[PDB]
Each structure stands twice: as C-alpha cells, then as structure tokens.
Design a protein around this nucleic acid. Sequence first.
RNA 1: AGCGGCGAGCGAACGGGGAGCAGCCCAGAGCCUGAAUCAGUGUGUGUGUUAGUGGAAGCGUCUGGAAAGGCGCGCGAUACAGGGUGACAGCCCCGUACACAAAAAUGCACAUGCUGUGAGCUCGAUGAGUAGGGCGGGACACGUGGUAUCCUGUCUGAAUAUGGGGGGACCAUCCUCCAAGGCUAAAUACUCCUGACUGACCGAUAGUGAACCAGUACCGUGAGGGAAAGGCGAAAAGAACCCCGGCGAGGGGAGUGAAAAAGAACCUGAAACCGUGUACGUACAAGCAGUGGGAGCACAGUGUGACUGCGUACCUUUUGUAUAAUGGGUCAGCGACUUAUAUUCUGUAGCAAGGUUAACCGAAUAGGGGAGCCGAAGGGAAACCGAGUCUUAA
Lengths: 117, 143, 64, 201
Amino acid sequence: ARVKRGVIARARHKKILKQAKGYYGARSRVYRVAFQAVIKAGQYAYRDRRQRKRQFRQLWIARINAAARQNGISYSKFINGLKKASVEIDRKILADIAVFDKVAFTALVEKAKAALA
Amino acid sequence: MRLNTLSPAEGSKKAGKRLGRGIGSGLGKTGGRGHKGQKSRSGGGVRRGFEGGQMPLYRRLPKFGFTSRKAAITAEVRLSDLAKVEGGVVDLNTLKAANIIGIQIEFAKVILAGEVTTPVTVRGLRVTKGARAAIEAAGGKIE
Amino acid sequence: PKIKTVRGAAKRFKKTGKGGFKHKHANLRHILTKKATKRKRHLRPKAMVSKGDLGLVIACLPYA
Amino acid sequence: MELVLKDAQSALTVSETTFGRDFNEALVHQVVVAYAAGARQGTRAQKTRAEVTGSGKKPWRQKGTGRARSGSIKSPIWRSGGVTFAARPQDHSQKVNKKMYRGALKSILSELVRQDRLIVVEKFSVEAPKTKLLAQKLKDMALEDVLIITGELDENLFLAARNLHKVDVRDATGIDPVSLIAFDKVVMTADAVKQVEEMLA
RNA sequence: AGCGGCGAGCGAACGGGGAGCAGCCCAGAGCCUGAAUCAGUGUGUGUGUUAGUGGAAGCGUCUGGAAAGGCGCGCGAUACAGGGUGACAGCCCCGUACACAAAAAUGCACAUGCUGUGAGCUCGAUGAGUAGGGCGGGACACGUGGUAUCCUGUCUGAAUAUGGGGGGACCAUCCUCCAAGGCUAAAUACUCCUGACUGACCGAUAGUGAACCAGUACCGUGAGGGAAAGGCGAAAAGAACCCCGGCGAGGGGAGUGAAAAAGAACCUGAAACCGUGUACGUACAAGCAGUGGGAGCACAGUGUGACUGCGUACCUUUUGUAUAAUGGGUCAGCGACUUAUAUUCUGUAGCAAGGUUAACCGAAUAGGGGAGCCGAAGGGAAACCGAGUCUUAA
C-alpha cells in the first residue's frame, strides 16, 4: 500500500494560497511565505478582535468628550452626572446621538448637568 | 450480520502512536523523546542495569547458593490431582500417564492443596502431614 | 529472539511469592574482624530488594 | 431449538447451544478478520539501503564542498536509493483459539436462524451434472445468492455450481466464518446439519 | 544447566513430539558354486516432456464518434480464469472447462532378456606407531578452571576379547559399547534457469541500475562507477491543396477526425516562473507589508484600497533571539519511530482452576496433534519440609 501524496498536498497547499489573496509578492504565490503570512494574519485577527472593542470605545469617548464640551461640560463630569442621574446609556449610543440628533444630546447634557450639581 | 456490519468491541482497538506527524498529534518534532541526549538518538539508550557508571545492583551484591539438580526432578502433587490419575492408584508412573508431573521426574510429593474426595492409593510417593491426614480422611491408603 | 537473562543477576536474586526478590546482603565477604558482631548478625538474613531498585531487576530478570 | 425443513415440514432436532446462542459480535468480528488476514499472501518486498544496487563510495567528501553531507548514493533521502523501512514477505496469519473459532461458528449459525437465512433441506442433489438444472434448482426454491452445504461428496452438484457465481457448494467440514455471512441464504442438507451440530458440540 | 575481565555476552545436552526411516561391506579361506542383489545396455509396456486439435451459446433498441453501456427479451454453462475488440462482452474474437493427439527424440517408472559385480552355510578373523601419556595449541555452550571428551604440531608409547573405550577430575564396583578400514537412499539447503499460477506488491523521482537498443551514453589509465529517458488517436485517417517566408523555420487557412486547446516539442497539463488585457490603487511618503477601522471608485455581494490604530518573519537551539545565531532562492515529486521475535502491562474477547497447543499430519484458515508452556504453593543455599517454612539448641 504505497501512498502517493500529490493530490492531498496540492489541496492543502491550495487552501493556504487561497487565504493569501491580495498579499504582496511571494506572499500570494509561494507556499512557504504565504503560510506564515496566513498564520500571522490569523494571529493579528485574534488580537484585533480585542483591540476593536477598545478602539471603538476610544472613538466614542473622544466624540462624547467633544460633544459634551460644545454643551459646556467635560466628559468626566458628563459621565459622572449621568451615573448620579441613573441614566444607563452606553458610550456607543451616546456617541451615536452626538452626531445624529444633537438636540437629543443637549437634553442628555442638561439631565447630567442638573443631577450632578 | 453482514460483512459490512461487524464491529470490534469498544476499546478493543487502540490506535497506535504515530510519531513525528505535526503539532496537533502531540508527538511531533521529537517523537516523545525530548531533546538532545543519548536516549533521543536512534538506537541510543543504555543497557539493562546500567546506573551511569556506578556499580550496578546485580554486581554490587554477592552471588549466593547453588542449583540443586534434584529440584529439577521433583514435583508437587496437589490433592486436586489425586482424582485424575485413572485408577485410584497414584504411582510415579501413573501421574505421568495423566500428564500431572512431567516425564523426567523421579520424586513426587503429595501436598495438602485441595479436596481429595475419592478412595485413593498413594504408592511410592511422599506425602505431607496434612495430605496424610486428608487422604485417610477420605478413605485412602498410603504405601 | 528470546530475551537473554542477565546471568550475573540470576545468581544474585531469587523471586519470592508475592513477586519481589530476595538477595544476600553486601558487606559480609572479607574484612570482618573490625565489623561488630551485631552488624554482621543483621547481614546474615536475606533482604528484599528495595522499591527503587525493583525496576532495574525485572529489566534484568525477564524469566524470573 | 428446532429447524423446519423446506417441504417435509418435519423439524429435525438440533442442540440450542449451537443454533440458539446469543450473538457475540466481538467474537464473530475477530474470527471474520482472522479469516480475512489469514487469506493474505504476504508476498512483497522492497530494497533497503543495503540492497539497492550501488557502490558504498561516499559521493563527495565530508567537508569542504558546500553541499549537504552525504555518505551513500543509496540513502533513503536520495532519489533512486533506499526504502527506509522496506517491506519483507511476512505472515499475516492470526491465531484463533479453537473455542473462539467454535464459539464464533456457533454464534453465526444461531444468528442465521434469527434472520431466517438458514434453510435446512433434507436432500439437495441434482440428477445430471448440468448448470442448467441447478440454475432451475433454486428458482422454485427462490434462491439467487446461496451457499449449499452438504454432507456427502456430491461431484454432480459440485460442478453444477462451479460456474454460477452466487452459488457455493461445500462439504460441511470447510464451512468458515466469511462464507456463512457473505451469502444471502445458507441451505443445509439434513445429513449435513447433523455433522455440523456434532463438530461444534 | 553452565561458561564468563562470573563483566559485555555466550549458551547446551538428557529427555519428549515429529519429517523420514535401508543397512551393508573389506581386513578370508572352504563347501555351494548367476544365489537374490546393485549397475550399465537393449527391446517392451505404462507414463509424462518437446509441435498441437476440437471447443458453446444474442439479438432488436436508445444515447453515442464508436456499443461491450441503458432499457427490452432470449440462450450456453463440468466453460461467468483472463485478454482483446471504437466505452464496461458468458453468448464478437482469442481462449477457458472439457474431450483429444506424436514421425521422431528424450525424463520416469515397470516388465525384463542379455552382460559386469556378487549370495547362502561352515568356520576362523576383529583395522599399532594407533589408544593413552608429557608439552603447545585448537574444537566442544564449556575462556585450563577441580575438568571430562574430541582433533593433533612435537616427543613418546600400550594392551590385541581371559582385552579394550566411555559413563564430566580421579578410584572401586557394574552398566554399556568394540576405536585405530570403507560404502550408504529419504527427510534437509539452494535457484543461474524453464513452465504455469498468485499477490490488502510497484505503477515511470516508484518497481530491477535498466518498462525505452541499459550495464548503454558518460566518467576513469585501470579496477570500477554509472545515468536520464514511457503514453497522438479507435484507426495514420499522421495534415492534399492555398497563403506569408529565405524553394526556410515557424505560422494562417483548407482537410482528416468525436476531438488538433489529440499536429508528432502530441492523454490529462498543477505549481513555481513569464507575459498581455481589464478594474482599482500608486510619483511629500519611511520599517515583517499584515490586521482592525475605513472613505472614494469600478462592477454585479465582489474587486481595489487612500487615510488610520496596533504590529520587529518562520524554524532550530537556548537562561534568553526581530536578532547582526542556525537552516531555507522558489515550486513540484520523494524524504525520518518501522519489521521480526521474546517479554511485561493496559484495553478487549473466549474459556476458567484450569487455559492453550508447537512442529507435523491434514479433504488446509476446519479437524487431528496436549510434546510442551503458563497457572492453581510456598519457604530454604540445599537436602528437605510443606499452608507453612527458614532462622536458631530453641
């Protein structure tokens, strides 16, 4: 029972070169380079599923901070004023309000500025 | 019950370690052998009783005794074998006819090892003190 | 092929009933005037092979 | 148990140990595999690095040239030299215990009366040694893939199934694991089931 | 069991189961006197081998380039082993099962006739520079060790059946045998070679080194080494003729064909690698080239990806590597925990105080074969004793 392995090594190699589309140069064509391109690209994909949840929370907080300061309060006092008022909206939606319905944000700032001070 | 329906018992066939076949098998890149030493080489591994070069235990200790050459020609007859001797007379040569002792045996002893039931006749053998008290307890005469 | 018994081990050990090995004690060959009679008295019975040594002995005695 | 005949309707007596045992699948799988492995003609071999035709000359020197170190043109890393663990002709037979072989056959014959694939006849014989008559033999019997097991040395019947592919004639002493399973009906003459009951005790 | 720097290791016999099983001559003279033998040679028979002969049965139909395929309906089969045929054939072919055949030359038996050896009976005879020994070696499982036995280079040297050898130093008994002459079938080992037949053997980097004009081309003074290289199609029907060209090479038609993207540099035609066309991006932007976010654009979700956050390959080896330590130009193919036997343990299965056979026989995976092996008893160095036993006067 000799086993030739040309068919399943072709398929195993083809599966990895298919995951390497768009890569530069020999990282799309050569298996040895494209294998560790794909293994590194899965490593980054694991890491940046963590960093995506930080980078967006970074982006919301920077926008609520700007939109609070147009209404005359900082991000810290707005978030403290919302918690003392028991408002439980998260920062994804607080930033969504801040660009799309600004008059629904100036009401939120007022409800924070009131119950803070 | 066709040829494509018969299965082994569960756990009757373990697979078999296939060494050096990748990361997922848990046996790749060393073959379960660890890193570079004598024992990870092909054919490497020291002989039996090697201790390093410390004097081995079978050479640290004294030889004792001798081989008897009479223990090779003696055997023990359990009382379980007094019913199979085909005639009720336990000679030396009738224990061999029933394949109890062995053809090169010159001395047999009958020891108390289980349930003599029948009228038996031990002739020309040795019996112990327990076996004599059991053969006569079933109605047997020892010569 | 059959496994060859280490024949020098087959003169040092004898297998007992529950499976272990009896052996003569060392230190009772020569140089005995200086040894105490109590110490020489305790080397005269046969001892059992220790726990850690037993794997080295059954390796040596496969037909014990 | 009881084994009803094909048409005389007078069921001969068998011992229930041989035809009414519980089925043991691990026992029958082992004896159907050892039959299958003992049919292997283990005749193959390849060449090791010793046996490949070549010289033991070291191809280049050990040092100096910037090529990987080699010492034989017949090493298995090299093309056209050396299978690493090359085959030899071997014996693929297995040992079966007699009480495992007889326990399997007693468990197959017990299962053949469960799935109604044992039919006992009292005589199965054919007048002329002609395949045409036996081809008729089982149409009325309604058989196409069958194993006939007889007790006598019928050579007229034996030739008449030598060309029919799905029909096998035996002599009640060479019935085996794989033959009692790979046929759809097993048909036994009444003199033959007397002998098969005997040898399986 | 023993041997053994009693280390590494070496490793029997006796006895038992089997295969196969024949014993005979000369050292010698008589009666009898070819008296079976065992050979060779020659007719004769039986049987192979070396050429061979006969073989048995299917047509319509649809797809298709072509039917052996499909659907329909028959027939042979002691033959449905295999192969070929335009795709997969029991019934087309070659065969196969079966039944047969030999001028001539040979293998084997037998029948033997004719030649060579040479019986049976009476008696005697009973293998000397040998056995043994001293010395030195070697062989025996046995390394000179307490060491038998065998062989003999050297030096010696018997007894002659009322005598001699051996029985593991040696001796006495008493068992057994008769060295110093020779022949001897089968069971056994092997395969350059021939015939069939088979394969959980290979399928062109494999399998022989060699599927092919291969021990060749080549290399070496030489001994020697030693390659690579299979496939058009069903059939050459292997491309008439016309064009461009140099009366080229190559190409474009035309044609053959099912197919020429089957055109001979010929099945399939992967990947590296190299082009052309198209979409998008790109000429103020720094780094493992991805990843997360993400516009714009082009298509019918896909493609691209400006800008942007994070981000120093892989392996190996290490206390520790982006490491400026190792390894790799890349692709494709091959490339490394096997096999035999023994042993122990776990799983599992069968049978259990029993369980199993080995060789071999065998209608061959059956059945027979229980020689054995392991277990049911152990203590003791051993004799021995024995559910106890050793220790010790206890």
